[PDB]
Amino acid sequence: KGKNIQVVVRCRPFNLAERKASAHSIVECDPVRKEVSVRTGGLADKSSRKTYTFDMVFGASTKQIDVYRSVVCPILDEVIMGYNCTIFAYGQTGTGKTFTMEGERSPNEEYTWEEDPLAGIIPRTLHQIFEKLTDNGTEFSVKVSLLEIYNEELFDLLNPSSDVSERLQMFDDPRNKRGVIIKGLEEITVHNKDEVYQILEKGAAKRTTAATLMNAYSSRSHSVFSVTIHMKETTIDGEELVKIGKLNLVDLAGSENINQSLLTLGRVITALVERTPHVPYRESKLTRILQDSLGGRTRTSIIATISPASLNLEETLSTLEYAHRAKNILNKPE
Numbered sequence: 072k073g074k075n076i077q078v079v080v081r082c083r084p085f086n087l088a089e090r091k092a093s094a095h096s097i098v099e100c101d102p103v104r105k106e107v108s109v110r111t112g113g114l115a116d117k118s119s120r121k122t123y124t125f126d127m128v129f130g131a132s133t134k135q136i137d138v139y140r141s142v143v144c145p146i147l148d149e150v151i152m153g154y155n156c157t158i159f160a161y162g163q164t165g166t167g168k169t170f171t172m173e174g175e176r177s178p179n180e181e182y183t184w185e186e187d188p189l190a191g192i193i194p195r196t197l198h199q200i201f202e203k204l205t206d207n208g209t210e211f212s213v214k215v216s217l218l219e220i221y222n223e224e225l226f227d228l229l230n231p232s233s234d235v236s237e238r239l240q241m242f243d244d245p246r247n248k249r250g251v252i253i254k255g256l257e258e259i260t261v262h263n264k265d266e267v268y269q270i271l272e273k274g275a276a277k278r279t280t281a282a283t284l285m286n287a288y289s290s291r292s293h294s295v296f297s298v299t300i301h302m303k304e305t306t307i308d309g310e311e312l313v314k315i316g317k318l319n320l321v322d323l324a325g326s327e328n329i330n331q332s333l334l335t336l337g338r339v340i341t342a343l344v345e346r347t348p349h350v351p352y353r354e355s356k357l358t359r360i361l362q363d364s365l366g367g368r369t370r371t372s373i374i375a376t377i378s379p380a381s382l383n384l385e386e387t388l389s390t391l392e393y394a395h396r397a398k399n400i401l402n403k404p405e
């Protein structure tokens with residue numbers, strides 16, 4: 072008892088701009104063999120390709136529901152059992168980190184947020200939480216906070232009584248040693264499924280007001296969306312089980328090459344896989360906050376997003392090489 076960090080790769084399909092220009096892919100996926108092959112240069116007539124094996128692989132045709140049913144539901148269940156799980160998204164801007172985590176809405180109001188097929192991890196997860204706990208006989212309370220880092224300043228994106236210019240501050244919990252205390256960050260209680268949306272949307276709004284202030288805010292900022300569940304399960308025979316589960320959904324700043332947290336994460340990951348005594352957790356806010364998610368007592372997953380365009384070959388390969396090194400990181404949950 073321990074468990075490796077599981078890494079999945081998700082290629083995005085071509086957009087219309089790429090299709091109208093008869094875009095040809097330099098990427099291939101074999102979910103069955105769990106491999107991703109990349110045409111590192113040359114022709115489809117004859118070429119050289121680089122292959123990588125990950126814990127899971129999802130090609131361009133993969134829909135949100137697929138990702139949720141495969142990687143998220145199983146991790147949500149662990150969370151409901153009373154554990155800590157963290158999921159990430161890593162990749163160059165434009166590859167789908169935000170689609171994956173939050174997703175979007177189908178045009179012309181064709182749908183309600185609960186059935187929108189374009190929904191990503193965050194909302195589908197908040198919807199199931201109520202769907203699975205209200206079902207059985209469990210007393211629970213759910214909580215959410217959306218913390219984001221920009222050039223090492225922390226921003227609270229869900230306090231509708233504050234503005235965002237205000238940075239919050241970080242301190243170490245004298246209680247837990249692999250933890251920090253973020254003074255003032257608000258924790259919004261989601262009383263029921265029909266409250267989930269406005270809460271998200273509000274964060275959407277505060278965010279667009281963050282984009283006006285900070286340059287490239289959506290590309291250079293790290294987003295940590297946390298949902299905390301307090302459950303008091305009473306079995307049918309009548310036993311009381313008091314659990315506390317926490318899930319962190321992190322949308323990292325684009326990997327494309329200033330960002331102290333991005334650089335540190337890579338250095339922390341290097342130390343962990345190279346079994347180096349000192350792990351530079353403290354050299355960045357992101358890594359101190361999420362210290363337990365990297366060689367800690369939390370179940371971690373990294374979803375690496377990539378592009379199929381030949382224009383992004385170089386960045387696509389850095390992302391794979393990076394994600395592939397992560398696989399060797401060891402975590403001990405209980």
Ligand SMILES: Nc1ncnc2c1ncn2[C@@H]1O[C@H](COP(=O)(O)OP(=O)(O)O)[C@@H](O)[C@H]1O
Pocket residue numbers: 082083084133162163164165166167168169170171325376
């Ligand atoms: N898996 C996908 N399926 C359909 N569209 C996608 C997918 N991944 C990315 N896209 C599209 O690509 C663009 C890149 O989106 P985004 O999620 O914002 O990327 P990033 O956060 O990595 O910068 C969006 O317009 C989005 O709709």
Ligand SMILES: CC1=C(C(=O)c2ccccc2)[C@@H](c2cccc(O)c2)NC(=S)N1C
Pocket residue numbers: 172173174175176177184185187189190191193194217268270271272273274275278
């Ligand atoms: C607000 C919001 C989302 C979020 O998860 C989110 C964004 C910013 C901060 C916190 C959460 C997500 C979404 C939500 C519900 C249904 C859906 O289909 C897509 N994507 C969009 S477009 N919206 C409207």
Ligand SMILES: [Cl-]
Pocket residue numbers: 136186187188189
């Ligand atoms: Cl769906």
Ligand SMILES: [K+]
Pocket residue numbers: 081082083084129130131132133134
């Ligand atoms: K896909």
Ligand SMILES: [Mg+2]
Pocket residue numbers: 168169289290
């Ligand atoms: Mg984004």
